[PDB]
Every structure is written in structure tokens, then in C-alpha cells.
Amino acid sequence: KQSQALPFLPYPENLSGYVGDAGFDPLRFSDYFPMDYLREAEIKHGRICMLATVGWIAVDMGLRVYPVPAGLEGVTAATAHDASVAQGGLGQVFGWVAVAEMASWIGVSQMLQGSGREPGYFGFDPLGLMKGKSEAEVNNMKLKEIKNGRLAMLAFSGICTQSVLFDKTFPF
């Protein structure tokens, strides 16, 4: 009845499944927006930032692709966006993200009209890793994804701001 993260606010009451729940949501976006959309957005914000904070850390700590293509030679992670769109690069990344996001949009749109799809469910599990696991263990691994995703969202925002404001690379 009371929120766990904020034990003076009531429980938001729309978070009752949803493995990463702290009862946290004070502004009650779960009251106004569908929780299937909100968890799909949290998961997608999470696994993008998990790749992004590892890709910003790797590029700032040396580690270019070898051999380096033309136009990406003296370039850090804070200047690799515009240098890659001039080289080509992100133009092909944008093309294949677009055909993934247009196809996943039909997944999100059919999830909000039924279809029983879990938010943040694609078929992508090629290395097994869920070969008949129990639902208490499936929901535990889903909690590890949301917790690590929630950390990398705050981490990338720290890394990207500090690398541009104080003008340094990631071991500041």
C-alpha cells in the first residue's frame, strides 16, 4: 500500500508485475501511460546505453578499428559522431537501425493492442541461456538487465557530459 522507495508516498498500483519494480514512480507516469510502453521504453533506453557507455569508453581508451578508415584518424568519442557521418559509417548504421526500429514498431503497436508480447521481447537469444529456466530465474535475469540498464543510462550521461564539459577522455 506504501511505496518501498519512498515510504511516505502510496504505492502507484500499476507496477504489480514488472520485475524491476521499486514502487518508485512518484510522478505516476504508470498511472497515465501504458506500462507495456513504459517498460519497453525503459528496456530500450537501457540496452542502448549499455552499448553506448561501452562504446564511448572503448573509443576514449584507444581502440580504433584497424585499419582506421579515412577521416577518423585524430578523433575522440566526443567528435566521432560528425566524423563518421562524413565518412559514411553512421549512415549505414542509421539505415539498419531504421529497418530494425520500423519492424519493432509493429511489435510495439501490436503489443499495445493485445498480442501477449512481453515488453522488451524479441526472439534474440541465440546462445541458449534460457533452456527451460524457471520463471523465478527468468524474472531474476530480467531484473539484472533492467538494473544494469538503469546504471548505464546514468553512467553514459555522466561520461558524455564530463567528457565534453571538462574536455577530457574517460579516465578523467
Binding site: 519512498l6 511516505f8 508516498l9 510522478l27
Partner: peptide, 22 residues
């Protein structure tokens, strides 16, 4: 914005006492 404004609307709904921030 994140704590006090949801606190004063829960106070108006009657599920927390005024002044109580836990």
C-alpha cells in the same frame, strides 16, 4: 518537483500526513 509535489497531492487525497517525509 519529484518528491514534494507528489507528496502534497497524496496529502490532498488523504493517504499521507502533512509534513511527513518519512
Amino acid at each position: 518537483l519529484v518528491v514534494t509535489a507528489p507528496a502534497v497531492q497524496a496529502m490532498g487525497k488523504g493517504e499521507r500526513e502533512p509534513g511527513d517525509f518519512g
